[PDB]
């Protein structure tokens, strides 16, 4: 692709983040024959159901409500898209490490604090460790933006794929291990093990066992002995500058570019990359990003931006 503005979880083959393709059909039939009224221009138009209207293209199909879906970019044929993952075109830098890098994920704070998806994966991992996962009633174990955020846990838990098979299946245990915990039990430390166990409140010697057989101190964690046993800090200025609303430099991207064909300056007033040409000897109809006329290329890799 020249430009990607959506990226989707892939499992097999990818098993990982990859650009997605965005599609529409009629949500009546169900074929490629919705013509839209209007392109859409964020997230809530491909996700909402049957937020955007046009005409079914059958003489047999009365059908008027769209119907959105993507495919992995990375090969012929359905992947679910990671809708807080955007491409970083403006260069903003990371809330945690302060570098420059794409895709980045958008938190859902009133901030919309931007972090790298290399920290994400880094967040992620530390508070597993750290078991400072957040519990919400309606949804399960999720994280609030990293700096801390009211009303920011990540909803669509699907963006835990993101962090690999590994990781991402230690995230799934976390609650059934966080039950334990809270009710005073032990998971085994052993590498490989994590079983979670409950032993009698008063006894230091726990044994792995219905597990890996593993007898231990539950104080030190260690092979169990008689005897005495022997990151979440955000800087407030790379907090401000990491917002994905907040006023930036001009890139080599200008904000004002003018017509393909007339050469005369426009503005462009949305998210939609479909542009019309406002003269009215011109009406070009042309892709803001790639400068050349619209195209189902452009629709597929690149429809909005964020
Ligand atoms: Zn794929
Ligand atoms: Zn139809
Ligand atoms: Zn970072
Ligand atoms: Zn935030
Ligand atoms: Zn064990
Ligand atoms: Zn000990
Ligand atoms: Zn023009
Ligand atoms: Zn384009």
Redo the contacts with the bound molecule.
Sequence with gaps: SIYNSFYVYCKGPCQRVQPGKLRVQCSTCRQATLTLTQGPSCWDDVLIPNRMSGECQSPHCPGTSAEFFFKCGAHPTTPVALHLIATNSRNITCITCTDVRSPVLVFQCNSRHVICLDCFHLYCVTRLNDRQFVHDPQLGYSLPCVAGCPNSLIKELHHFRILGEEQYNRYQQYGAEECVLQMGGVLCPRPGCGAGLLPEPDQ?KVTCEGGCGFA???????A??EG???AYRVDERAAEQARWEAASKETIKKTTKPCPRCHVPVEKNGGCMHMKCPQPQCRLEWCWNCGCEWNRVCMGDHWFDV
């Design positions: 230091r231990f101190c539950r104080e030190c964690k260690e169990y002995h005495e046993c022997s």
